[PDB]
Amino acid sequence: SMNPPPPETSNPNKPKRQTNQLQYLLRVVLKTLWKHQFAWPFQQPVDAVKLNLPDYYKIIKTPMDMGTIKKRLENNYYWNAQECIQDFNTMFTNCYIYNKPGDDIVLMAEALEKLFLQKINELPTE
Numbered sequence: 277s278m279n280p281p282p283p284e285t286s287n288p289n290k291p292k293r294q295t296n297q298l299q300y301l302l303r304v305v306l307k308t309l310w311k312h313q314f315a316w317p318f319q320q321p322v323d324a325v326k327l328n329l330p331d332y333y334k335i336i337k338t339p340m341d342m343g344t345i346k347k348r349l350e351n352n353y354y355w356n357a358q359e360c361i362q363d364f365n366t367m368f369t370n371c372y373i374y375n376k377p378g379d380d381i382v383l384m385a386e387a388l389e390k391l392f393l394q395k396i397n398e399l400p401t402e
């Protein structure tokens with residue numbers, strides 16, 4: 277079995293910015309989810325080899341995880357907050373696509389997503 281290359285976290289020819297919204301996404305949103313008791317399955321790319329999930333990357337073609345998001349934020353990879361919000365939403369959606377309703381992993385994603393929504397509700401104006 278093989279894992280794919282992880283999502284990129286640096287791309288020198290991609291234009292980058294540091295906005296107050298992106299700062300909030302790191303200092304408030306990511307930090308809140310990262311410290312949560314249910315964060316651990318989401319802190320690095322899914323290791324389909326070790327988890328014995330050979331179909332994971334057959335079903336999930338746009339993988340995303342908080343380790344990737346954290347590095348993107350720390351490296352100022354994004355142009356705007358919407359790009360980063362999309363990454364969080366991709367991460368949650370992938371979990372719901374792959375897994376079964378009520379699975380532990382889905383309950384974990386739901387708990388993190390609730391906090392995400394609470395924090396994004398107060399995203400500052402630019």
Ligand SMILES: CC(=O)c1c(C)[nH]c(-c2csc(N3CCNCC3)n2)c1CCC(C)C
Binds near residue numbers: 318320374
């Ligand atoms: C399939 C799924 O949606 C999953 C997601 C987002 N995460 C995990 C998971 C478990 S353990 C771990 N890591 C990652 C990297 N660092 C080591 C610990 N990730 C899964 C598998 C759940 C179940 C189907 C076996």
